Amino acid sequence: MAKQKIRIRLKAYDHRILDQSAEKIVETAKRSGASVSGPIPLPTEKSVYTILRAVHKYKDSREQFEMRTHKRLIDIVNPTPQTVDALMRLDLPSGVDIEIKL
Amino acid sequence: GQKVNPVGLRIGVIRDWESKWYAGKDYADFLHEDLKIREYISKRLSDASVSKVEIERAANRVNITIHTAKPGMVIGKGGSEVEALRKALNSLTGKRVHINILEIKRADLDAQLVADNIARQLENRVSFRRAQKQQIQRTMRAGAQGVKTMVSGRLGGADIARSEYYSEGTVPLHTLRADIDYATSEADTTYGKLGVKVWIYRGEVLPTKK
Amino acid sequence: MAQVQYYGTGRRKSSVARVRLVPGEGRIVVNNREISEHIPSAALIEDIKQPLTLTETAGTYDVLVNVHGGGLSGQAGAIRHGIARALLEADPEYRTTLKRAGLLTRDARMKERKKYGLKGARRAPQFSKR
Amino acid sequence: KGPVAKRDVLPDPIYNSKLVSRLINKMMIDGKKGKSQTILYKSFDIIKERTGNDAMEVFEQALKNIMPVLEVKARRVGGANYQVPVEVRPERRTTLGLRWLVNYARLRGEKTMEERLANEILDAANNTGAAVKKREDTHKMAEANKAFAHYRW
Amino acid sequence: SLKKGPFVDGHLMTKIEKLNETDKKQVVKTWSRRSTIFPQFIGHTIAVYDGRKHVPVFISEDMVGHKLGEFAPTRTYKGHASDD
Amino acid sequence: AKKSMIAKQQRTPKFKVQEYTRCERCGRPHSVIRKFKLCRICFRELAYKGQIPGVKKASW
RNA sequence: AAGAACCUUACCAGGUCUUGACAUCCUCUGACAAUCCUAGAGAUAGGACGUCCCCUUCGGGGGCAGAGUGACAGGUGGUGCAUGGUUGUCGUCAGCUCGUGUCGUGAGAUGUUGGGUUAAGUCCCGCAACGAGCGCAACCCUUGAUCUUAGUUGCCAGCAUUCAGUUGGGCACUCUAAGGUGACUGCCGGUGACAAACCGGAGGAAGGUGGGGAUGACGUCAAAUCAUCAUGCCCCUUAUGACCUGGGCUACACACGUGCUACAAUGGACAGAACAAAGGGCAGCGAAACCGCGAGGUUAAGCCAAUCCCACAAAUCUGUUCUCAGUUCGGAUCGCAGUCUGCAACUCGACUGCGUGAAGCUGGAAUCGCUAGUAAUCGCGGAUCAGCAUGCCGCGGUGAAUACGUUCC
């Protein structure tokens, strides 16, 4: 009964942009479609960075700026070509890492 | 410190980054092209002026929207100027471009503009004290819960060095919802450069839910 | 789908455990291994088994537990808090004696993140005047 | 300020009592409960082997025998130091007892650490050894010079 | 080094080759001290460029795998105050 | 001599190993992270300027 | 200094250039650019093979080179006793001030003192003062409890399957990240003016600013950085500039600061067994198979990664063995033979095999850290990075002793 299915994945630094993008990318899945799996959470990987405060010495004082990387997955049992043609247009967001695979 | 920049704290919790995008195979190259766009907008800062440019990119696309107190300076007559700028940027970025424009209401309220203006006043060799007073009066005309301002380096050419600051109303940088605008500027008198700083407390932001 | 059994998650310092109090002989099972075997010898294992003995004594219920993360003592402590909370879910009435026992809460504590300029997240290597 | 709360130790399963757990805390080095565990059980075993008696009894008599009744406390009010004798807190009593116990046990020089802990604890049982001698030395520094710490301070 | 093999810059190779086949010229300066001594190179005397001054170096049969520039130390001794 | 240095770097090295990392915003070599090719101070000032998401600062 | 073999590098020595290595204006031709040979250490010069492109009725447009030319360009040159900018320090100490008014000839004072209370100028009450601003606090992040939403690459309990959560299935649970719940002295008791607050107890996953981080107030030290950048002034310019080879930044009689490893039987050595977290990876991580004692190599699957790889956790536990000594303690130093990276490992790289087996058997005077998951200690990862991490930044394992107290520093 198992069959290959399209499984779009999203990635972004900001999360509000990411789950707004998730809602926008599943909303097209809902119309002219069926089932529509929700956006399941992924572990997310941050990158820490310690940098010196002073231009010269005083290495004892520093600061940690870091960049987290969120990830998400979305699925749909029915390929439904009409919402795939609808999928081609995406006004938002400029900052998103959608990836399509079947 | 002794004074950490509020702009380095406000971002994230209460304000958006000046340039948002995603990366990507080349995180550096997007940053290079964007910093270059800052380098040319800085050339546009010479007279046309700008408070800030917001930037967005999505693979072979860019959204370098501008907001400025004087919108017609960059549009020109017939809109030819924004087009020529669009070509000048298209020649460099190597990708499609469509620069946007915005006209801020009560533009004096913005920290960048008042800081650039008082800096130009320092270029005009007007007394720095009276200039800061006119700053506080003008921002008072702008209407705000609290405002602070500061200048450093040579002042009137007197003494080896001096620093001054004036303020009125609450200016709570330690507040995490303060939404305080921050600005810096660099005057260039023959006696020497003049450091410029200004803090603008727009007021607390109340979180929403649906 | 078999005979009814209670279960209680129990973690400590990034070591999570999933106990299952199925009634039976009372022999304990950790990762398909005996507690006498999985952590020889180790006497502390009896301290992992103490809360059941401190409460009326004794059933004794069989335990099927699956634990992951942490070291041996940490995962064993997870077995302890895990059988403790499961014993809490056994009957509501027992909880009163449990207040005298403490033996719950799992106090969250774990090694502190290192401070910059410090080796032990608190310790400073050295100081010297002049 | 004020007094601080102190945690009670998890009781040792063998022999039940928490005080033995206090030994598990003190004898331990490099943060190893297991090494203290092995030396503890081998200690009970070697006590079981020579001169038969309950380990808890000889241990109890030993710890009762190694607690000082008084202790001096140096204070420089002027030229040269001036120790002040005072009655010891029972927690401080068992603390000094166990610390001088493990310390002198460390220096016994025997090839087996457990056997020399045994010889040491039996020396405490027999009112002898370096530990009892040291408590006696503290007894000498005390009493003989308690007059400055009579009821003054 | 490693394998295949010791590495002269290669100009010294043709130089010592031509000097071996004919002429038998003696004493020649070189800036490339990195080159290792070779069996074909034997018996030649090279002025070695330490930097401050060239130091001439004869080549005994015993030296091959040692670097040609190793024999001349750029370092100046010692220098110390009160000897003995 | 930073102009001479950036001129030295932008030109192709005689050997590929030679190419040390350096930021474009400033000509200072050394202590430049390779992953972002920014100055520690370059990245510092841009950090107060805020160039990338997000949080910032000193989490976890 | 988050990587000095060359480069970096600035400094030295030698070899070379003067509108220049780098930017612009002019006139001005011409595409620019490369393919090799010759001489040289390179730097570059001497030759040929070569470029001679794109839009225009001929003026041109375009990068770009070359030529000359005045301009200029250039300095990690001097000045942090000219600075902007950025950062230490007292100090995450609780103070520093202003508006109005009052008092004082005046400077100044009152407010900010006093009583109680607090980590706090914290709150409360009173007070010739009433307010307010910058801080503390709160607001944020992280950690812990729980719910809801959402179940793959992650998850395996209930079911069958298998060498294997691996494969059917399950999407409970662990786990994952969004929105919520929860702590506020609030509930009780006592003290206190019935105020603030403290103490005790209950409730509770966490109790009395829960733990940690971020958050550093007016200012002090003419504190640090002209050498990140920017630059006032001063100085140099066929040279304080530029190119290159090699050096040096690693010196060596010694002093000091700061780490690492040990001086050993709670141990060393061997064998077996067992428990992590977090981070990194496509110019990359590189499994498995095979070759070599080892380091690595040959070859190559998979992985843009909750899939796969870096990758095995180490202490520990279980036994065997040595039986108290410069030792089966420790590893120094050096020799020989290999190996990774790189045009290239002499100066001045790392690692391995073999051999050699310093000193040190716990350290004077003196001095440092730390109140609990802290000290103690064991391994792992990353930034750095061709190669080079005992340093730095993190991750987790194991995990205490003591706090009578403000006499003294």
Short mmCIF file of all heavy atoms in Angstrom, two decimals, chain G residues 23-24 28-33 62-66:
data_model
loop_
_atom_site.label_atom_id
_atom_site.label_comp_id
_atom_site.label_asym_id
_atom_site.label_seq_id
_atom_site.Cartn_x
_atom_site.Cartn_y
_atom_site.Cartn_z
P A G 23 43.48 49.73 -9.52
OP1 A G 23 42.45 48.86 -10.09
OP2 A G 23 44.69 50.04 -10.29
"O5'" A G 23 42.79 51.11 -9.11
"C5'" A G 23 41.69 51.13 -8.22
"C4'" A G 23 41.20 52.54 -7.97
"O4'" A G 23 42.11 53.23 -7.08
"C3'" A G 23 41.14 53.45 -9.19
"O3'" A G 23 39.99 53.23 -9.99
"C2'" A G 23 41.19 54.83 -8.57
"O2'" A G 23 39.93 55.19 -8.02
"C1'" A G 23 42.17 54.60 -7.41
N9 A G 23 43.56 54.93 -7.79
C8 A G 23 44.55 54.04 -8.04
N7 A G 23 45.67 54.74 -8.36
C5 A G 23 45.37 56.08 -8.32
C6 A G 23 46.13 57.23 -8.56
N6 A G 23 47.36 57.12 -9.09
N1 A G 23 45.57 58.46 -8.44
C2 A G 23 44.25 58.58 -8.08
N3 A G 23 43.49 57.45 -7.85
C4 A G 23 44.07 56.20 -7.97
P U G 24 40.03 53.54 -11.56
OP1 U G 24 38.83 52.92 -12.19
OP2 U G 24 41.38 53.20 -12.07
"O5'" U G 24 39.86 55.12 -11.64
"C5'" U G 24 38.69 55.75 -11.13
"C4'" U G 24 38.85 57.25 -11.07
"O4'" U G 24 39.94 57.60 -10.18
"C3'" U G 24 39.21 57.94 -12.38
"O3'" U G 24 38.09 58.13 -13.23
"C2'" U G 24 39.84 59.24 -11.90
"O2'" U G 24 38.85 60.17 -11.51
"C1'" U G 24 40.59 58.77 -10.65
N1 U G 24 42.01 58.45 -10.94
C2 U G 24 42.89 59.51 -11.00
O2 U G 24 42.55 60.67 -10.83
N3 U G 24 44.19 59.17 -11.27
C4 U G 24 44.69 57.90 -11.48
O4 U G 24 45.89 57.75 -11.71
C5 U G 24 43.71 56.86 -11.40
C6 U G 24 42.44 57.16 -11.14
P C G 28 43.21 62.92 -28.75
OP1 C G 28 43.29 63.57 -30.08
OP2 C G 28 41.88 62.61 -28.16
"O5'" C G 28 44.04 61.56 -28.82
"C5'" C G 28 45.41 61.56 -29.17
"C4'" C G 28 46.10 60.29 -28.73
"O4'" C G 28 45.98 60.15 -27.29
"C3'" C G 28 45.53 59.00 -29.28
"O3'" C G 28 45.97 58.70 -30.59
"C2'" C G 28 45.96 57.97 -28.24
"O2'" C G 28 47.33 57.62 -28.43
"C1'" C G 28 45.86 58.79 -26.95
N1 C G 28 44.56 58.58 -26.26
C2 C G 28 44.39 57.44 -25.47
O2 C G 28 45.33 56.64 -25.36
N3 C G 28 43.21 57.24 -24.83
C4 C G 28 42.22 58.12 -24.97
N4 C G 28 41.08 57.88 -24.33
C5 C G 28 42.36 59.29 -25.78
C6 C G 28 43.54 59.48 -26.39
P U G 29 44.95 58.77 -31.83
OP1 U G 29 45.75 58.89 -33.07
OP2 U G 29 43.92 59.80 -31.52
"O5'" U G 29 44.25 57.35 -31.83
"C5'" U G 29 44.72 56.30 -32.66
"C4'" U G 29 45.71 55.42 -31.93
"O4'" U G 29 45.72 55.77 -30.52
"C3'" U G 29 45.43 53.93 -31.95
"O3'" U G 29 45.85 53.29 -33.14
"C2'" U G 29 46.16 53.44 -30.71
"O2'" U G 29 47.55 53.34 -30.95
"C1'" U G 29 45.93 54.61 -29.74
N1 U G 29 44.75 54.40 -28.88
C2 U G 29 44.89 53.57 -27.78
O2 U G 29 45.94 53.01 -27.50
N3 U G 29 43.76 53.41 -27.02
C4 U G 29 42.52 53.99 -27.24
O4 U G 29 41.60 53.75 -26.46
C5 U G 29 42.46 54.83 -28.40
C6 U G 29 43.54 55.00 -29.15
P G G 30 44.89 52.22 -33.87
OP1 G G 30 45.61 51.69 -35.05
OP2 G G 30 43.55 52.84 -34.04
"O5'" G G 30 44.75 51.04 -32.80
"C5'" G G 30 45.88 50.28 -32.40
"C4'" G G 30 45.64 49.58 -31.08
"O4'" G G 30 45.10 50.53 -30.12
"C3'" G G 30 44.62 48.46 -31.10
"O3'" G G 30 45.16 47.23 -31.57
"C2'" G G 30 44.15 48.40 -29.65
"O2'" G G 30 45.11 47.73 -28.84
"C1'" G G 30 44.17 49.89 -29.28
N9 G G 30 42.85 50.52 -29.48
C8 G G 30 42.45 51.28 -30.54
N7 G G 30 41.22 51.70 -30.44
C5 G G 30 40.78 51.18 -29.23
C6 G G 30 39.52 51.30 -28.58
O6 G G 30 38.51 51.91 -28.96
N1 G G 30 39.50 50.62 -27.37
C2 G G 30 40.56 49.91 -26.85
N2 G G 30 40.34 49.31 -25.67
N3 G G 30 41.73 49.79 -27.45
C4 G G 30 41.77 50.45 -28.62
P A G 31 44.19 45.99 -31.89
OP1 A G 31 44.94 45.04 -32.72
OP2 A G 31 42.91 46.52 -32.36
"O5'" A G 31 43.95 45.31 -30.47
"C5'" A G 31 42.72 44.69 -30.15
"C4'" A G 31 42.04 45.37 -28.99
"O4'" A G 31 40.61 45.11 -29.04
"C3'" A G 31 42.45 44.89 -27.61
"O3'" A G 31 43.65 45.48 -27.15
"C2'" A G 31 41.23 45.23 -26.76
"O2'" A G 31 41.23 46.62 -26.43
"C1'" A G 31 40.09 44.97 -27.74
N9 A G 31 39.55 43.60 -27.60
C8 A G 31 40.00 42.50 -28.25
N7 A G 31 39.24 41.44 -27.86
C5 A G 31 38.30 41.89 -26.96
C6 A G 31 37.28 41.23 -26.26
N6 A G 31 36.97 39.96 -26.57
N1 A G 31 36.48 41.93 -25.42
C2 A G 31 36.66 43.28 -25.26
N3 A G 31 37.67 43.93 -25.94
C4 A G 31 38.49 43.22 -26.80
P C G 32 44.89 44.57 -26.70
OP1 C G 32 46.11 45.41 -26.69
OP2 C G 32 44.86 43.33 -27.52
"O5'" C G 32 44.55 44.17 -25.20
"C5'" C G 32 44.36 45.17 -24.21
"C4'" C G 32 43.38 44.72 -23.15
"O4'" C G 32 42.15 44.28 -23.78
"C3'" C G 32 43.81 43.53 -22.30
"O3'" C G 32 44.68 43.89 -21.24
"C2'" C G 32 42.48 42.95 -21.84
"O2'" C G 32 41.97 43.71 -20.75
"C1'" C G 32 41.60 43.20 -23.06
N1 C G 32 41.53 42.02 -23.95
C2 C G 32 40.65 40.98 -23.62
O2 C G 32 39.96 41.08 -22.60
N3 C G 32 40.58 39.89 -24.43
C4 C G 32 41.34 39.82 -25.52
N4 C G 32 41.24 38.73 -26.29
C5 C G 32 42.24 40.86 -25.88
C6 C G 32 42.30 41.93 -25.07
P A G 33 46.08 43.12 -21.04
OP1 A G 33 46.63 43.50 -19.73
OP2 A G 33 46.88 43.31 -22.25
"O5'" A G 33 45.67 41.58 -20.95
"C5'" A G 33 44.89 41.09 -19.87
"C4'" A G 33 44.23 39.78 -20.24
"O4'" A G 33 43.66 39.87 -21.57
"C3'" A G 33 45.15 38.57 -20.30
"O3'" A G 33 45.35 37.97 -19.03
"C2'" A G 33 44.46 37.66 -21.30
"O2'" A G 33 43.37 36.98 -20.70
"C1'" A G 33 43.91 38.69 -22.29
N9 A G 33 44.86 38.99 -23.38
C8 A G 33 45.46 40.18 -23.57
N7 A G 33 46.26 40.09 -24.67
C5 A G 33 46.15 38.81 -25.16
C6 A G 33 46.74 38.18 -26.26
N6 A G 33 47.44 38.90 -27.15
N1 A G 33 46.45 36.89 -26.54
C2 A G 33 45.57 36.19 -25.74
N3 A G 33 44.99 36.81 -24.66
C4 A G 33 45.28 38.13 -24.37
P G G 62 31.67 55.31 -22.86
OP1 G G 62 31.42 55.98 -21.56
OP2 G G 62 32.83 55.73 -23.69
"O5'" G G 62 31.79 53.75 -22.60
"C5'" G G 62 30.77 53.04 -21.91
"C4'" G G 62 30.96 51.55 -22.02
"O4'" G G 62 30.95 51.15 -23.41
"C3'" G G 62 32.27 51.00 -21.49
"O3'" G G 62 32.27 50.85 -20.08
"C2'" G G 62 32.42 49.69 -22.24
"O2'" G G 62 31.60 48.68 -21.66
"C1'" G G 62 31.84 50.06 -23.61
N9 G G 62 32.88 50.47 -24.56
C8 G G 62 33.14 51.73 -25.02
N7 G G 62 34.14 51.78 -25.87
C5 G G 62 34.56 50.46 -25.97
C6 G G 62 35.60 49.88 -26.74
O6 G G 62 36.39 50.44 -27.52
N1 G G 62 35.68 48.51 -26.55
C2 G G 62 34.86 47.78 -25.73
N2 G G 62 35.10 46.46 -25.68
N3 G G 62 33.89 48.30 -25.00
C4 G G 62 33.79 49.63 -25.17
P G G 63 32.84 52.02 -19.14
OP1 G G 63 31.69 52.76 -18.56
OP2 G G 63 33.88 52.76 -19.90
"O5'" G G 63 33.57 51.24 -17.95
"C5'" G G 63 34.87 50.70 -18.13
"C4'" G G 63 34.84 49.20 -18.24
"O4'" G G 63 34.39 48.81 -19.57
"C3'" G G 63 36.18 48.50 -18.09
"O3'" G G 63 36.57 48.33 -16.74
"C2'" G G 63 35.95 47.19 -18.83
"O2'" G G 63 35.22 46.28 -18.03
"C1'" G G 63 35.06 47.65 -19.99
N9 G G 63 35.84 47.97 -21.20
C8 G G 63 35.91 49.18 -21.84
N7 G G 63 36.68 49.17 -22.89
C5 G G 63 37.15 47.86 -22.95
C6 G G 63 38.03 47.25 -23.89
O6 G G 63 38.58 47.75 -24.87
N1 G G 63 38.24 45.91 -23.58
C2 G G 63 37.68 45.24 -22.52
N2 G G 63 38.01 43.95 -22.39
N3 G G 63 36.86 45.80 -21.64
C4 G G 63 36.64 47.11 -21.92
P C G 64 37.93 48.98 -16.20
OP1 C G 64 38.16 48.50 -14.82
OP2 C G 64 37.89 50.44 -16.48
"O5'" C G 64 39.06 48.34 -17.13
"C5'" C G 64 39.30 46.94 -17.13
"C4'" C G 64 40.23 46.54 -18.25
"O4'" C G 64 39.56 46.72 -19.53
"C3'" C G 64 41.50 47.36 -18.38
"O3'" C G 64 42.51 46.96 -17.46
"C2'" C G 64 41.88 47.14 -19.84
"O2'" C G 64 42.50 45.88 -20.01
"C1'" C G 64 40.51 47.10 -20.51
N1 C G 64 40.11 48.42 -21.06
C2 C G 64 40.60 48.80 -22.31
O2 C G 64 41.34 48.02 -22.93
N3 C G 64 40.25 50.00 -22.82
C4 C G 64 39.44 50.81 -22.14
N4 C G 64 39.12 51.99 -22.68
C5 C G 64 38.93 50.45 -20.85
C6 C G 64 39.29 49.26 -20.36
P A G 65 43.62 48.02 -16.98
OP1 A G 65 44.17 47.55 -15.71
OP2 A G 65 43.04 49.36 -17.07
"O5'" A G 65 44.76 47.90 -18.09
"C5'" A G 65 45.37 46.65 -18.36
"C4'" A G 65 45.99 46.62 -19.74
"O4'" A G 65 45.00 46.97 -20.73
"C3'" A G 65 47.11 47.62 -19.98
"O3'" A G 65 48.35 47.19 -19.44
"C2'" A G 65 47.11 47.75 -21.50
"O2'" A G 65 47.79 46.66 -22.10
"C1'" A G 65 45.62 47.62 -21.82
N9 A G 65 44.98 48.94 -22.01
C8 A G 65 44.54 49.76 -21.03
N7 A G 65 44.01 50.87 -21.61
C5 A G 65 44.13 50.74 -22.97
C6 A G 65 43.76 51.57 -24.04
N6 A G 65 43.00 52.65 -23.80
N1 A G 65 43.99 51.19 -25.31
C2 A G 65 44.60 49.98 -25.57
N3 A G 65 44.97 49.16 -24.53
C4 A G 65 44.72 49.55 -23.22
P G G 66 49.34 48.25 -18.75
OP1 G G 66 50.40 47.50 -18.05
OP2 G G 66 48.51 49.23 -18.00
"O5'" G G 66 50.00 49.01 -19.99
"C5'" G G 66 50.72 48.29 -20.98
"C4'" G G 66 50.90 49.12 -22.23
"O4'" G G 66 49.62 49.32 -22.88
"C3'" G G 66 51.44 50.53 -22.02
"O3'" G G 66 52.85 50.56 -21.85
"C2'" G G 66 50.95 51.26 -23.26
"O2'" G G 66 51.77 50.96 -24.38
"C1'" G G 66 49.58 50.60 -23.47
N9 G G 66 48.49 51.38 -22.84
C8 G G 66 47.93 51.16 -21.61
N7 G G 66 46.98 52.01 -21.32
C5 G G 66 46.91 52.84 -22.44
C6 G G 66 46.07 53.94 -22.71
O6 G G 66 45.18 54.43 -22.00
N1 G G 66 46.33 54.49 -23.96
C2 G G 66 47.29 54.03 -24.84
N2 G G 66 47.39 54.70 -26.00
N3 G G 66 48.08 53.00 -24.60
C4 G G 66 47.84 52.46 -23.39
#
